[PDB]
Amino acid sequence: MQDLEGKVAFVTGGGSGVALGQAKVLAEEAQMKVVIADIRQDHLDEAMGYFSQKNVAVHPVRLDLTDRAAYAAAVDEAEQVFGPVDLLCNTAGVSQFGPIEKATFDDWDWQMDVNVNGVINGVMTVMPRMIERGQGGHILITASMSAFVALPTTGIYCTTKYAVRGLAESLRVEMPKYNIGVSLLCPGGEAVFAGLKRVIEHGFDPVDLGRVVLDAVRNDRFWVLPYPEFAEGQKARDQEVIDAMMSYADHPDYARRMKIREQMKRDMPG
Amino acid sequence: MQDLEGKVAFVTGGGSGVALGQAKVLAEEAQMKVVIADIRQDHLDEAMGYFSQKNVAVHPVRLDLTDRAAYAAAVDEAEQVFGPVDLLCNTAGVSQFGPIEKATFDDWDWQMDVNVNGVINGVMTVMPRMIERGQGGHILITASMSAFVALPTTGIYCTTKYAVRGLAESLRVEMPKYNIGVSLLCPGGEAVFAGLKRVIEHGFDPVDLGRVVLDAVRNDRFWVLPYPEFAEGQKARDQEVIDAMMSYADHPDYARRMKIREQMKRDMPG
């Protein structure tokens, strides 16, 4: 998405952490009009304490993303204060780790509701408005490297991040015909995976990651995975799947399905 | 898992389709005691019409998998009728396709509840009982190739199948120390992906897929992806991710993180 100056961003979880980092970069460098949406009033107040000392247009709104009615009201508010949302940053998220066999249903529901339904709720509130307006837009989903790597004690968290990865890849298919860009950011934050993870954890800065995001939005990049470390590890995970698929090769049902297409490759136009 | 004869299977959605195919193979060939759990009474009655003409031990229970209290009661019933569940087959699933921008919240909630919460509910009801009993077990999750491939109009469905894929890969990490095996089946059911898909769709038989499952359980295989076709297509999808990670290689932050580990590779034991 180009010419971000003066365009409107809606950033969830924007009162703290990664999302606040996104808000700062979008409001300050990119000069967007930014709405920060957060459930905690004290986090909002802290953020606005910062932004009140910068040349920015930032509007806070206290919002529980799991509340669909309130979400619609909050986006209405964004439109009244600034204008239609151009960039939606679904970045709010929570986590609590533990042995999966000790997880409670309350543990599941809380993390599922914020990490998955909160993202669904934003996408379904804003994306239809983008389409209706016909001026394009952009949707960012902040997942995690847990959308690629299951770890001990991260069972619930991993499930939620795989979910929104799926949603992101789904948006990626259907949004380009409406000139709506899609980005999927997967922060870090094998015993070797954890070790590589620890090194990025210590160099991670929310503003720095905010600039990675900014650059992805401008250039309309989908896979925002700024960790070349995880490549060789991911190649191994990938090869497992490929090998599993190929392990049924010699199994004659595959050879049958081969023969059908070879014939259909003949017989028909293209 | 070995010596399946006389052991107890709990098969969700077992009144019809893929799950019924699993139930038939487990009850007949493997000679397991099988509980088929289904929300529809007429599907149960149909299935038992079949099983009443076979030398099997099959017990029907009408169950809405989204009802946690009823799920616990249904598993209790399984234990009273046969004994503790040895094999849990989370196979029930629903689907409704359409443009993602036209999806309703009711559309989301229905598919999310059955496809994700239904699986979570089974896993959390049964797996802690398996651990407590200390005799091992096995957990099957039936997802879909939509856990790897986003398609037009399959946005909700894809999101749910990515989710349970994540859950499956998470179980895979934590269950082996309890001697509980995990399998992830991804049925079929690029314009080339759809074309390859259509060819398997037409050769798919629930009993045949049931035997693929049986073989995976016996040999404790995780990736049950019996389609070597999707390999080259999946390699391309994989390469996208690898390339994205590697695209930040020349970016000096990576070179910094390199240097830190090289030093930590020295300095310390292993």
Ordered by start, the domain boundaries in chain B are: 1-229, 230-270
How many Cβ atoms are within 10 Å of B250's Cβ, its own excluded?
9
Residue A61, H or E segment: strand A57-62
Q: Which two tokens stand for residue A1?
A: 């998405």
In chain A, which residues have their Cβ closer than 8 Å to the Cβ of B163? 116, 159-160, 162-163, 166
CB A162 within 8 A of CB A150: no
Entry resolution (Å):
1.7
CB B158 within 8 A of CB A166: yes
CB B151 within 8 A of CB B190: no
Say what angle helices A155-174 and A118-133 make with each other, to 10 degrees.
Answer: 10
Min CA distance, B186 vs chain A (Å)? 11
Question: B139 has which bridge partners?
Answer: B88, B182
Residue appearing with tokens 């136009």 = A269
- E strands present in A171-214: 180-185
Sign of CA dihedral B166, B172, B178, B183: positive
CB B248 within 8 A of CB A216: no
Interchain pair B150, A161: CB under 8 A: no
- Breaks in chain B after (C-N > 2.5 angstroms): 189
The counts of H helices and E strands in chain A are 10, 7
CB B191 within 8 A of CB B233: no
In CATH terms, the fold of domain A1-229 is Rossmann fold (3.40.50)
B245, amino acid identity? M
Largest alpha-carbon pair distance within chain B? 71
Distance separating alpha carbons of residues A79 and A70, to the nearest angstrom? 14
CB B155 within 8 A of CB B146: no
Instruction: Give me the residues of B, 23-82, that contact A with CB < 8 A.
Output: 68
- Residue B202 labelled as part of a binding site: no
Distance separating alpha carbons of residues A183 and A7, to the nearest angstrom? 17
Q: Which of B200, B117, B164 is nearest to A162 (CA)?
A: B164
In chain B, which residues have their Cβ closer than 8 Å to the Cβ of A230? 245
Question: B90 has which bridge partners?
Answer: B141
Q: Please, which residues have CB within 8 angstroms of residue A166's CB and are 6 or more apart in sequence?
A: B146, B147, B150, B158, B159, B160, B161, B162, B163
Instruction: Give me the residues of B, 165-204, that contact A with CB < 8 A.
Output: 165-167, 169-174, 178, 195-196, 199-200, 203
Nearest residue in B to A249, CA atom:
B228
Question: A87 has which bridge partners?
Answer: A9, A138
Q: Is residue A238 helix, strand or coil?
A: helix
Residue appearing with tokens 């946005």 = B155
CB B91 within 8 A of CB B54: no
Residue appearing with tokens 């090194």 = A199
Q: Which two tokens stand for residue B120?
A: 């979570």
Question: Could you say which of B120, B150, B221 has the minimum Cβ distance to residue A169?
Answer: B150
Kindly calculate the radius of gyration of chain B based on its CA atoms and give it in whole angstroms.
21
Q: Please, which residues have CB within 8 angstroms of residue A27's CB and are 6 or more apart in sequence?
A: A9, A33, A34, A51, A54, A56, A57, A58
Question: Could you say which of A146, A174, A225 has the minimum Cβ distance to residue B152?
Answer: A174
Distance of CA B31 to the CA centre of its chain: 22
Distance separating alpha carbons of residues B73 and B67, to the nearest angstrom? 10
CA distances from A104 to A263, B40, B123, B124 (A): 54, 28, 12, 8
Phi-psi category of residue A6: left, alpha or beta, with phi > 0 → left and psi -120 to 50 → alpha: left
B121, amino acid identity? N
For B259, counting Cβ atoms within 10 Å of its Cβ (0-12 exposed, 13-18 middle, 19+ buried), the class is exposed
Q: Which of A85, A34, A41 is nearest to A56 (CA)?
A: A34
DSSP-assigned states of every residue in B47-115 = HHHHHTTSS-EEEEEE--TT-HHHHHHHHHHHHHHT-S-SEEEE---------GGG--HHHHHHHHIII
CA distances from B233 to A176, B145, B149, B196 (A): 21, 12, 10, 10
Residue B2, H or E segment: none
- Breaks in chain A after (C-N > 2.5 angstroms): 189
Sign of CA dihedral B62, B6, B209, B233: positive
Residue A70, H or E segment: helix A68-81
Question: B11 has which bridge partners?
Answer: B36, B89
- Enzyme catalytic residues of B: 157
Q: Which of A63, A55, A66 is nearest to A32 (CA)?
A: A55
CB B109 within 8 A of CB B117: no
β-pairing, B33-38 with B137-142? unpaired
Distance separating alpha carbons of residues A186 and A105, to the nearest angstrom? 26
Distance separating alpha carbons of residues B75 and A28, to the nearest angstrom? 57
CA distance between the termini of chain A: 36
Residue A129, H or E segment: helix A118-133
For B111, counting Cβ atoms within 10 Å of its Cβ (0-12 exposed, 13-18 middle, 19+ buried), the class is buried
In chain A, which residues have their Cβ closer than 8 Å to the Cβ of B155? 167, 170-171, 173-174
Strand order in the sheet with B223-224: B57-62, B33-38, B8-12, B87-90, B137-142, B180-185, B223-224
DSSP-assigned states of every residue in B217-258 = HHTT-SEE---TTHHHHHHHHHHHHHHHHHTTSSSHHHHHHH
Sign of CA dihedral A220, A226, A228, A232: negative
CB B70 within 8 A of CB B15: no
